[PDB]
Structures are given as structure tokens and as C-alpha cells.
Write a protein that binds this DNA or RNA. Structure first.
Ligand SMILES: Nc1ncnc2c1ncn2[C@@H]1O[C@H](COP(=O)(O)OP(=O)(O)OP(O)(O)=S)[C@@H](O)[C@H]1O
Ligand SMILES: Nc1ncnc2c1ncn2[C@@H]1O[C@H](COP(=O)(O)OP(=O)(O)OP(O)(O)=S)[C@@H](O)[C@H]1O
Ligand SMILES: [Mg+2]
Ligand SMILES: [Mg+2]
Lengths: 32, 333, 98, 333
DNA sequence: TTTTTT
């Protein structure tokens, strides 16, 4: 159970802002 | 048959609402002239371009924030001076208790006409702002450092006493009681905010602004002003390079940026902004470090170009009208 | 167990959804999951979550000959840490989940 | 018509605010004498020149920070002595618990009249400062090493306990509750800060100051004082060469530097500053290592020139007054 | 809501 922040980080250009509304999930439930 | 009955019912309901609450209680959005967005210049042409509508919106709420010595008070005093040059009445609610009247005069502010208040508590400041808005005779109101909007309970309290979100509740109630009054009276309320650090932020901006979250929602425009350099006359630091980001905009496209120089004792360098905008709009030619206008080499470098354009008011005015006509997305009537 | 397989510091590991396509040659594409370890110091050539002038970016960190943020796409250009640029690295990407 | 109604509404609102809160709640900035900036000497003429307004502003917050043994306490004690020579009452909050009364007396501080407090906790220190500001009988208050302003919870805790930003909360609340009281009572509050290291900073200044960010916003003048060398009488180190850089200024132009000598047991070398300012202002001629005043060769080297100038009071006062009317941008009334 | 720390 680790944070999955709602906002997506833009790898192309520096994003205008990064809010961090925090959603939490575990690896096993997220991928399996 | 059915449509006629629906129209009759709608007309009866509208008439009942108008009788109950007033003539302007409800009307079609297209024929509501009071809802039109009217703007005033911020003292920076590039910022007027970045705001889309040509300046800060009248009758709204605007938040300005940034780090220390980023130029919040100087930008606010330029806004106030620009408003006062048009005959508007402005008020400065300085909660920081750190206003210099001499410097305000040096920026072009008519200190003989600017209302200044040193409120003891945040509630007193917000009540003064509410009264000034309800009067309708004040066009611009500025609250300096809403971080200093201390509640009366905290003032009467001790250092270290915990007042959880009490300032936030006071600010929320102030926004609720102020939005309608400001819209009715066509008064622009500018809030100046400081930046606090956010602890335990794994990802995201670790900076908030004091006062809570209500100011984030109620602000029509939120500006993030930062100092990104210094202006040097060889050795002495005579000014600062400033970048202003419009992180929120309810009247135009947001996230546009503006760059301008704040000169100490003079304020925002308008003529340098004119130079930069003319260069960008293919009106002033830049050949390396050489600036030229219509073939005539006006100088070498931004400072020399600014001095030359200051020395020739006619061409400065010409380039100013050309830039205002071309760049402004929403030219004011 | 994926947690023991991929995560070294559970208390300082967060997931990030990638956006954009400037890291395709580096293995990161739009929509991919980025596992970031914030407890480890960044090094030259590492993939980091970084913020330049308050604007967040995923980029490759270089410290020589100058401090810059370089992408992994031929279309995009490097970001040079210029005067009054505050490069805040918020962790190192250790895994990419597609 | 419309203008007259606006003036009537504005006057009515001003009267309402004055009745609700008080006579001085709201008034025009031009006719508000409580907002005039009053300054007091810092004990160094070069520092007064660099500050523009002639010294540290009264009724404001000033932060002085630097590395270890840079002269923060010495500069503060010189400020206190200069204030006391004018009959003012000064207070020293020694949170570091490292004040030597004999050395303070050696700098000219009236020990019998200096209110000294050694608070146990940071909350106690800030509450004592708030009470002294509210009393109105204290003109200068100094908080020694706000890095030592440890909160009560940290004191009652254990070593290794994480009190994350608690000092920042306490200091922010202190600024919020203290700005207005200091402005009302015309009290100068000097905060002495230590310098810590920002780990992991690749580009930028790696040095930060303790207490958080509130002091950065609220301080009217912030001084970075550093030791740049030693003053030697042949072999023994009798003093230190000190540079003070004004990193923030809310009363004049910032980023000016002041260089002076702090002699152990004597304080800031005023006469050496007089020598340097006379040389710079074309009052004292310097021919290589030879200094001359109006043709008379006065001595060989800075130390010999300073000793000459000590040996005569008349042209000492002459050069001092000439420098004061020449270099001082904002002479005090 | 509140606020860095080395
Ligand atoms: N009286 C003054 N004379 C000269 N320069 C000044 C004066 N007051 C402020 N400045 C400088 O002008 C720039 C902007 O000043 P401000 O408007 O006070 O900035 P600020 O955003 O209000 O920062 P704060 O309020 O102190 S946190 C800074 O570089 C200041 O050092
Ligand atoms: N009692 C004293 N007698 C002689 N010299 C002293 C005395 N106390 C301090 N000094 C010297 O005076 C210079 C400045 O001292 P301070 O003003 O205490 O420095 P500081 O800024 O207070 O740094 P701190 O507080 O020790 S971290 C240093 O060179 C000290 O060694
Ligand atoms: Mg301000
Ligand atoms: Mg000390």
C-alpha cells in the first residue's frame, strides 16, 4: 500500500504544476 | 400547446422571483451587462498580455504570492498607481505593518489619496475590506500578507497555543461574505500571500500559501511572482529580474508567463517591456547585441535600447500602440 | 512477493504515472508506471523526478560539464540549469511498469 | 453628481470604520505619521551608509545571521549601546545562554540598564519579547540565536525525537503576533540567526537559516555578517575584518555591503571606518601607502592613519560630518 | 489546517 499520486508527471515538458492528491495501492493488487 | 404553457410558467416564475428579490435577481446571461468582465492594467504590459483580458478583473478576487522579496508589494503598488492614474480610489490594508510611504510615493502611488489601514487582527482587516467593498467608492483593495491576518483569539492567546485552522475558517468566512459584495460594487480585491513549506511531501509542489484553501477557490486570478535574477549597472544591483506565472485564470487562458524588470525606486520597467515585446513582434530588430528600429540602430543591449526609447517619446508611443493592437488577445473597449 | 523483489525502502517509495514521450529511448512512455525511491541520492546519469523553476519533469541528470536535465528522445531538447534555477530532485526512478 | 455621491459614501464608510475600530484604524497614507520610517544608528558608519535610511528601522523586525564568530553578538551589542546613548531602553533575550556581561560592558553597553533574559524555552522567549513590545517602555529587543529558540515540546522530549517543523510553526506564529505590536509600540526587534547547510543542493546557495521561512518574509532588513580576515598588531590578532551584506531591505536599496573592523574589547572601529569613508569621498588623499588630509601627510598605512585621526578630535568631527552630509542618502530629521 | 530539518 503505497501512494499513487493522482496527477501525472509530464516527461515531455516541465509540467505547469504538480498537485499530489494521494491515492494508495499495493503492487500485487495493482499489477496482478 | 405544451410549449406555450411551459413559456407561461417560466415567465410567471421569473416575475415572481423578480418581485421577491429584485429587478436584477434573475435574467438571461446574454443580456446581463453587470456580468461583463472589466479589467485594469497591472502596470506591466507583459503581464497584461499574459492575463489575456488586458489586466486584473474588476469586481473579483486576486491572489499574489511568492518567496521573500519577490516583488509582491511593488507589483501591488504599480496596480494601485495605474488605477489611481485613472481616477479610481484605492485602499491598502497592510497586515504586515511593513509599508514605506516614501517608497510607495516613489513608485507613482498618490499617497495623499491612498487609504492605508494597520489592522490589529485579521478579523478587523477583513471587516474593513468588507466595509470598503459595501461602500462602493473604493475600486481596488489590497490586503498585504494574509499570512499576517491573525485571528483575535490568537492575538489574545499565547505563543505556542494551537489554533487549528482558525485562520483558515476566518478566511473562508471572509471569502463567503466578500465575493458577492465585491461583485456588486465592482471592487477588485487583491490578496498578497506568502509561501510556506509543506513537510513530508514525497512528490509534488512542497509550497502552499497561508490562509487556507478558500482563497484558492474564490480567487479569479492567482499570480506566482518570483525573482529570477538581478539588474546590474556594472557593479551596483539597480533592479531585479521578475517572472510572473498566472497559475489560475477564470477570465482567460491560465499558465501564461510574463517577464519584467523591477527597478528600485522606479518599479516595473515598462520601457524594457516595450522593447522586449517589440522585438518579439517583429517591430524592433535585434542583430545579436544590436537593437534597431526600421533600420535605425537604437542602441546596444537592452539597457541602451530602453534608454533610447525613453529619449524618444514619439516612437515609444508608436511601438506601444502597435504592440497593444497586435499582441492583446482581448483588447478592452 | 513483488514488494521484496522491487522495493528496497518501503517507507520512501512512491508510484508515478508517466505522461509524455520524451523518455521512449530510455524505456519510459506515456502512461507507464514509475517506481521512485526518494531515500537514495541521485547520481550522474540516473533517471530522476526533478522540478525546475517549480515545474516538475522526468529527465536524466548530468553534472558535467554543466548541470543539465537531458531527455531520451531525439525530438526533445535538454534543459540546462540556468541562473536562478532550483533543480529539486524528488527521487530516482528504479523501475518502469508497462 | 456621481463623484459627490461616491465621496459621500466613502466618507460614511470611513466614519463607520473609525467608529467601529478606532481613530487611527483607517486614514490616508500621506497624513499618517505613524508610518514614517525612523532609524537608529547601528554603531558602524559604513553599515548606516549601506542601509540607506541611516540605520536599522524602528518598529520593524531585523534579522542578522552569519557563520560562527562572525560578530553577530558584537554588532548587536554595538546597536544596543548606540540606542542607550540616546536614552532608549534595550532588552537582550539570550537564548544561547552565552552572554558575557563584562564583555558587553567593554563594548559600551550600559549593563545596569540592559534587560537580560535567559529563557528556558523558545515559547518563553517569544512571549517575553511580545510582553516587552506590548509594554512600550522597551525600544530595542534582541533574540540571540533564534536557532536556540527550542520549543517546549522539544525540551520536554528526548534527543532523537522528531519535532518536524515545530520551531517553524512557533516562529511563524511569533512573527504573526509580533509585527503589529512592534509597529504599535515603535520597538525594534533584532533576531540573530545561525547558518545551517542545505544538504543535496546541487545548484544554488547551500546555506539556510534556522527558524523556517517566516523570518525571511517578516524581517524588514536582513544582514549577512561575515568575518573576511583578521586585524593584527604585528603578531597578536587584536581584531577581525568584518563584511556585512544587506541581503534584504524594506526601507532603502538592498544588496549594499559594509566593511569594518571589530576590535576585541572595543567593538566596531569607528575611526577606521571614518578613515575609509574620508578616503572614498575624496576627503583624505591616499598616495600609495601614504594617507594625506589637505596636504598634511598623516601616516603610513591604515592603522597609522586611524591612530593619527584618533589623536585629534577636531578634524575627526570635521571629516565625520562631511561624510555624513555627503554619503548619507536619507539623513534623519 | 499547520510548517522544515542537516
Ligand atoms: N524602500 C525601498 N527602496 C528600495 N528598494 C526597495 C524598497 N522596498 C523594497 N525594495 C526592493 O524592491 C524589491 C521588491 O520589494 P517588495 O515589493 O517589498 O517585495 P515583497 O514581495 O513585498 O517581499 P516582502 O513583502 O518583503 S516578503 C526587492 O528587491 C526589495 O529589496
Ligand atoms: N569576551 C570576549 N573578549 C574578547 N573577544 C571576544 C569575546 N567574545 C567574543 N570575542 C571575539 O569577538 C569576535 C566576535 O564575537 P561574537 O560577536 O560573539 O561572534 P558571534 O557572531 O556571536 O558568533 P557566535 O555567537 O559565537 S556562534 C570573535 O572573533 C570572538 O572571538
Ligand atoms: Mg509586502
Ligand atoms: Mg550569538
Amino acid at each position: 500500500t503505497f501512494p499513487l499520486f493522482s496527477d501525472l508527471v509530464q516527461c515531455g515538458f516541465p509540467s505547469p504544476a504538480a498537485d499530489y492528491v494521494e491515492q494508495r495501492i499495493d503492487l500485487n493488487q495493482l499489477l496482478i | 400547446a405544451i410549449d406555450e404553457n411551459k413559456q407561461k410558467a417560466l415567465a410567471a416564475a421569473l416575475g415572481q422571483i423578480e418581485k421577491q428579490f429584485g429587478k436584477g435577481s434573475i435574467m438571461r446571461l446574454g443580456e446581463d451587462r453587470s456580468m461583463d468582465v472589466e479589467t485594469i492594467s497591472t502596470g506591466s504590459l507583459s503581464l497584461d498580455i499574459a492575463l489575456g483580458a488586458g489586466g486584473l478583473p474588476m469586481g473579483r478576487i486576486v491572489e499574489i504570492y511568492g518567496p521573500e522579496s519577490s516583488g509582491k508589494t511593488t507589483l501591488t503598488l504599480q496596480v494601485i498607481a495605474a488605477a489611481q492614474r485613472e481616477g479610481k480610489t484605492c485602499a491598502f490594508i497592510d497586515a504586515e505593518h511593513a509599508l514605506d510611504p516614501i517608497y510607495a510615493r516613489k513608485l507613482g502611488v498618490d499617497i495623499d489619496n491612498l487609504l492605508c489601514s494597520q489592522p490589529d487582527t485579521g478579523e478587523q482587516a477583513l471587516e474593513i475590506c468588507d466595509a470598503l467593498a459595501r461602500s462602493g467608492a473604493v475600486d481596488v483593495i489590497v490586503v498585504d500578507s494574509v499570512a499576517a491576518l491573525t485571528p483575535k483569539a490568537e492575538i489574545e492567546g499565547e505563543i505556542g497555543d494551537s489554533h487549528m485552522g482558525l485562520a483558515a475558517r476566518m478566511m473562508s468566512q471572509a471569502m463567503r461574505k466578500l465575493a458577492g459584495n465585491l461583485k456588486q460594487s465592482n471592487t477588485l480585491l487583491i490578496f498578497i500571500n506568502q509561501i510556506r513549506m509543506k513537510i513530508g511531501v514525497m512528490f509534488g509542489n512542497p509550497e502552499t500559501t497561508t490562509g487556507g484553501n478558500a482563497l484558492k477557490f474564490y480567487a479569479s486570478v492567482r499570480l506566482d511572482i518570483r525573482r529570477i535574477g538581478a539588474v546590474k549597472e556594472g557593479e551596483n544591483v539597480v533592479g531585479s529580474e521578475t517572472r510572473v506565472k498566472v497559475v489560475k485564470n477564470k477570465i482567460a487562458a491560465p499558465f501564461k508567463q510574463a517577464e519584467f524588470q523591477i527597478l528600485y525606486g522606479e518599479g516595473i520597467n515598462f520601457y524594457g517591456e516595450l522593447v522586449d515585446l517589440g522585438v518579439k513582434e517583429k517591430l524592433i530588430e535585434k542583430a545579436g547585441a544590436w537593437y534597431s528600429y526600421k533600420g535605425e540602430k537604437i542602441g546596444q543591449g537592452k539597457a541602451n535600447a530602453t534608454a533610447w526609447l525613453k529619449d524618444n517619446p514619439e516612437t515609444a508611443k508608436e511601438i506601444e500602440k502597435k504592440v497593444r493592437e497586435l499582441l492583446l488577445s482581448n483588447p478592452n473597449s | 512477493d513483488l514488494n521484496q523483489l522491487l522495493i528496497q525502502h518501503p517507507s520512501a517509495t512512491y508510484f508515478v504515472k508517466a505522461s509524455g514521450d520524451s523518455m521512449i529511448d530510455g524505456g519510459i512512455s506515456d502512461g507507464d508506471l514509475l517506481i521512485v525511491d526518494s531515500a537514495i541520492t541521485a547520481s550522474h546519469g540516473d533517471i530522476v523526478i526533478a522540478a525546475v523553476d517549480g515545474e516538475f519533469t522526468v529527465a536524466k541528470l548530468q553534472l558535467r560539464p554543466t548541470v543539465q536535465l537531458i531527455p531520451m528522445n531525439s525530438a526533445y531538447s535538454p534543459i540546462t540549469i540556468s541562473s536562478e534555477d532550483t533543480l529539486d530532485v524528488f527521487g530516482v526512478v528504479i523501475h518502469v511498469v508497462k
